Swiss-Prot record, chains A, B, C, D:
Lineage of producing organism: Bacteria, Bacillati, Actinomycetota, Actinomycetes, Mycobacteriales
Enzyme kind, highest EC tier: transferase
Record-listed E.C. numbers: 2.3.1.-
Additional free-text comment from the UniProt record: Increased expression of eis due to point mutations in the promoter region of eis is responsible for resistance to the second-line injectable drug kanamycin in a number of M.tuberculosis clinical isolates, through acetylation of its amino groups, which leads to inactivation of the drug.
Name assigned to this protein: N-acetyltransferase Eis
Top-level taxon: Bacteria
Annotated function: Effector that is released into the host cell and affects host immune responses; it negatively modulates inflammation, macrophage autophagy, and cell death through redox-dependent signaling. Acts as an acetyltransferase. Acetylates 'Lys-55' of dual-specificity protein phosphatase 16 (DUSP16)/mitogen-activated protein kinase phosphatase-7 (MKP-7), a JNK-specific phosphatase; this leads to the inhibition of JNK-dependent autophagy, phagosome maturation, and ROS (reactive oxygen species) generation for enhanced intracellular survival of M.tuberculosis.
Amino acid sequence: VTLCSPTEDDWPGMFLLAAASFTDFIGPESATAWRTLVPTDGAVVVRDSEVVGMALYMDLRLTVPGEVVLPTAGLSFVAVAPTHRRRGLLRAMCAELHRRIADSGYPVAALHASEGGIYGRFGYGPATTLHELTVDRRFARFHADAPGGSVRLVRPTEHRGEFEAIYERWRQQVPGGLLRPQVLWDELLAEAKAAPGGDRESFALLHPDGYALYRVDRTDLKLARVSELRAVTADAHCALWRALIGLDSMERISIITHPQDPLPHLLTDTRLARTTWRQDGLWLRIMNVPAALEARGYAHEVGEFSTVLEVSDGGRFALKIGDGRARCTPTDAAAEIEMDRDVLGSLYLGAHRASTLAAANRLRTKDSQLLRRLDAAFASDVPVQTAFEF
Amino acid sequence: VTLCSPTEDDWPGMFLLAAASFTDFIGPESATAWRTLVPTDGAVVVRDSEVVGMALYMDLRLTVPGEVVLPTAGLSFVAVAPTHRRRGLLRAMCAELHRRIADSGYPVAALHASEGGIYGRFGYGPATTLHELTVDRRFARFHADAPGGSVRLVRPTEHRGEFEAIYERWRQQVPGGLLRPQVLWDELLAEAKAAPGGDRESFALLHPDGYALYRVDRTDLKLARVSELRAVTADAHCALWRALIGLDSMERISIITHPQDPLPHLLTDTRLARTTWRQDGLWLRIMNVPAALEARGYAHEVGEFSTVLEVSDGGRFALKIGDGRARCTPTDAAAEIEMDRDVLGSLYLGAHRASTLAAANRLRTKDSQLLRRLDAAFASDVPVQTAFEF
Amino acid sequence: VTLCSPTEDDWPGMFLLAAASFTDFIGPESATAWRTLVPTDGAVVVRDSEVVGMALYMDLRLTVPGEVVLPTAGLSFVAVAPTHRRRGLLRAMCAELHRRIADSGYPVAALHASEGGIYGRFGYGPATTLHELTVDRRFARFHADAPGGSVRLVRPTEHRGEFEAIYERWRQQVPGGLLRPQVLWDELLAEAKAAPGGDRESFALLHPDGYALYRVDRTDLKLARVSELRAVTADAHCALWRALIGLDSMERISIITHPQDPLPHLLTDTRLARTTWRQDGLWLRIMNVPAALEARGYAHEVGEFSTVLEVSDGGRFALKIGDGRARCTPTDAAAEIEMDRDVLGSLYLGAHRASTLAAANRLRTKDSQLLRRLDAAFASDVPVQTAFEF
Amino acid sequence: VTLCSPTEDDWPGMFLLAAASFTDFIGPESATAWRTLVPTDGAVVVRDSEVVGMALYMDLRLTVPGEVVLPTAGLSFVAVAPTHRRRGLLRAMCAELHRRIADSGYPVAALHASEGGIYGRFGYGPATTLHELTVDRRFARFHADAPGGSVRLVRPTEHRGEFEAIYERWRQQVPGGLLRPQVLWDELLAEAKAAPGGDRESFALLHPDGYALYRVDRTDLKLARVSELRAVTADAHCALWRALIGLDSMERISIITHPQDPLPHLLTDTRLARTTWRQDGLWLRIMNVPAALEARGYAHEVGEFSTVLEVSDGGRFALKIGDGRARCTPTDAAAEIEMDRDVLGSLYLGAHRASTLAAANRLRTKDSQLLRRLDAAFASDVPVQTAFEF
């Protein structure tokens, strides 16, 4: 087997492995748009001579706590032929891409994981939580305190400019936000069209400061699935949900959102917004510990403290956090905190508490006070959300 | 209809309404043990003359952030006859018990709610979250970092003393903890016996600093249900879970736990600990705002700040928080924060973020900085858990 | 009603009855390929004047024990209008086709039965067994003794020549094998293309001496269905299954195979290859008892014996079996074995033991020793498989 | 940990591990009857001091091809505490019991396996196949050839003598038969009584030469489950099935039987007897290869042949088979057949063909002719059945 950058001739072999590996890849036209986001030298293939393994990264922009945008290597299109399992092909491909990503100056990489037991060992930590709420909208009454009591029903394709502009405001403001380039809007609005023997037509609820894309389920005609709700204000979020609760021909509204979605609190019965599903969303690998820890904002409420952080096989650093900024500098002083690289990725966007990872011995410290300070500092003011799967 | 304290002769009528209202009440012997926790004047009945409505409170001890134990009025045994709906019987009974509870000097009341749309309007806020994890234990491997790699399989009835002592340590240390008196241990260990055409025998996994009571499901013989796992140390929690993952004849282990249960992080695949169910656990009504806000501990990391808190129809208070202590004193100065009483109950044990209740307009403030300070201060160092249903 | 050979003008009426009778017949283009296998005078229709009944046979080549290929009349396209039940239309059509098949010199006829209670009375015996194995491939580990530890993932349409050649070797070597002409390869590879609102794309695992065609289930995206696995060697069979167990995004692999499929024995846990479904496959009617009994090979291990076989209303024969060859000649000597014609079809490819049919009194003999000799002689060295449905 | 024979004081600890390990063990009274079949020194326990592991064997009598009865060590009551997995406790206990079983002069051991991946490595091969048939009895019509067209509906407890005598004839005549002592009849007839919140009453269909015990399913009141059908003659088997098809208030009859059950062939529609479940039944470990190979009968139809059989780490033997008898004697001549010990157990009662185990490379030989001779010789005239689980 040989690991090399793919040639134009290697692409048909990649498209075949893709079709066999992913239920979401239909054919070459499926790749056209995502491929525009792959840099020169962004891809590796393993040849046997047919393609038996592939992996690439895409140039992305990820928003992190403090509204800081990081160049981010989005790992994607990762597959090993069913003929070639247990030959370390994934280890080799990830090691080569991580080399190129680090040398190219990316502070972090990110992916969505098809299984939860794979990417931990390559330094990726689950960093956002997908939280499915299902509302029995037939009982839903808004609380007296709920805002409203502004939104228009529209065809997505006739308001592209306004979705683009609302999303752009949303992604810059929310940790987990990704820049969504032209070609990904082209794909999104092509999926909005009804599919013969497939998904139904998508409709949109448009507010000046928010939108919701939703579609009636292919088989359950009493279920509306919100694919996407981007709200820049609490008013937009409430207004949009009043409209979704107004889909009177539906029994149930489902959305994949985040754990801190305020929806339940908009209702007289919080229990109506039922959690039907939870899973890891975006995974992060911190490529450069100092660049990542320095780039992001920290809680202003915690007072200035100093410690020494060791990442297992990732360096040791004097970490000083105060006025919501971090300085992270080389040191050989005794470590006060130790953790594998994945644990740091899981901490980085505020989705997992340090004290929770400590109780499981994934983060190790002998100062329970330093543990409380870590928790408070790495917390995100704005709750972390998931932008889109790649 | 007449609302009065029940006579000894009124009890049979109460036992009948109970049997008809609750699927967990079998007959008079069902009440013997809970009744020892009801004070003189702890109960009201509505007569028509048969019992058509009843409610009572029990003398409980609830642990709150900072390991402070509060005398707590546990509302229980609440029923309105199906013949007497929409006549304000529940409003009248709750108003009378709240009078007696406030006059008796209880700073808080608590309940478990049969529906989520009832008790908000009587000032009760959902204050803990039940979080069901189901582990496909056939794939569960412990992470390298996981502690262990101490527990004994025992009959519960032969180790009462040691369960009592571990629970007693657990309940004093964890927000949501309740004192469990002799008679509730008598009931718990009577349920542990196998029931003809009912639940199977309960077994116990005993560690010096923790226990788990579990039982094979009545119908699904590949599912083990953990009724209760009390761990005083991270080592006890990990040791106990290694033992539960060792139930090799089971496919699945389910437990009702709390959102911050470290279990997922003990595994190479975090996704194996699936959230199968979420719901409100304990509800709190703050009877006395100053006594409750002063009694509990606050985060040391937030710096001293001062504000004015109004509870809708519950008073206005100068609130000063610093060194993890609150002073809460009468004032007529302009409110900076407003909220209904239920919202304060939901904040009180740290289960709901102020910024989440604000985004839904349940908590109102014009200083986003004061909002961040509220969040950080009301956070609990030790994650809030649910002791037992009543 | 009139039973006659169909005219070109009768075909549209046949295509209509077909569309109404079979869920697998879409329209005239559905018949083009199968029709090339129908000889002049191979078809009958019953007219009322519209077509109310039809039946035909196709010219096939069936492999039987000893690698002997028989000209075989494949009954197919059999339907009676829902308007014309219980008028003996099926009896009349089968009697006419059996006349023409016998006169044309076919030693056997064969069919696949839509119900199990129809064709027994026309002399057809179930002769192969379909055996669905479903593997929970997430637990499947190969035994130390298992071969391998050679196959390529390919698009079927780009390797037609190599599938044709492997199948051709397979069908000549295995009892139940059918010759698959060009036009049936045209159809097979046309089904391999993904269908809008239909089956997904088929992929292929290609070995020098074997192939597997498989497809992800239309609705269950964790199930891969093997449509066809043709292995000429034990190495090819094992190599192909290692590749199928390598479909890591699947939970389950299902195949319709034969009872003696060695797959279970390739695993450390034989129980993982679960039998999810069993049914009769190919049915045989012996048209000419002497020609059929003489054409096939018998077990070399049984010693030369002689008996007299009566087929109810099918003749009586002196049957001498030795050196794996049979002589079967007319006689009026006392019968030692009696059975209906269907029973002989069920014995013929080795799928059903004589002693099993005897215990049910379908085969009658007064010598338990002759019964043991029949069992051993009619056994097939190579286990009987099912080629393709028609 | 210490492995020793259990003391009378160790029994309560064993009863506790049992209740926690097996859903079929209710308490000490559950063991009384099985314990009478355990010889002095038949049991081992591992102490930590509480019981954390146990295993024992029972003195059984197993019928093998040629109606030969073997003293058989029935492994049973095998458990490792959930606290003590992956410490080789099962390996140690099986090694000690195998020592004592071999020294005591047992030619074979047997067990029923709770999982299919455990006992292969200790030399146990699956030796019988459980085959669940479910009959939609509303369509079942007996074939014209079917016998009958003698049985009485009785209470089991009033005809113990006649069940005992029929079973005793059955078990001596059928490979897989076990002697059923008094105390196991006491248990069987105690289970026949209806259980409060449990199984319904068992009824019996009694023929001079056969019986069926059946019970209506606890939840599905249209399903009758045959627990046991012992037929000494084909007439008894047919007569009994006519009676079961006469349970006109039922939709479905289910029985766990053997693959060669003639039932399907008693019907005009063979497809009505649907295979709903298949699994390994009895597992065999050959303790002494020569004693086991010599004790059993072989097919008279195969001619005298000689070979050299090696069992991996179990000796090499000159094996001569002719006139349905084997001589099996020590040799150092070149092996012609090799296999692990488990493979020999799987061959021993005729349930698995040598050529099937060869195709999976579990049995290795370079003479395809010797393979055909092995198949034919190890075949059982009387189809192997499963007596009762232990």
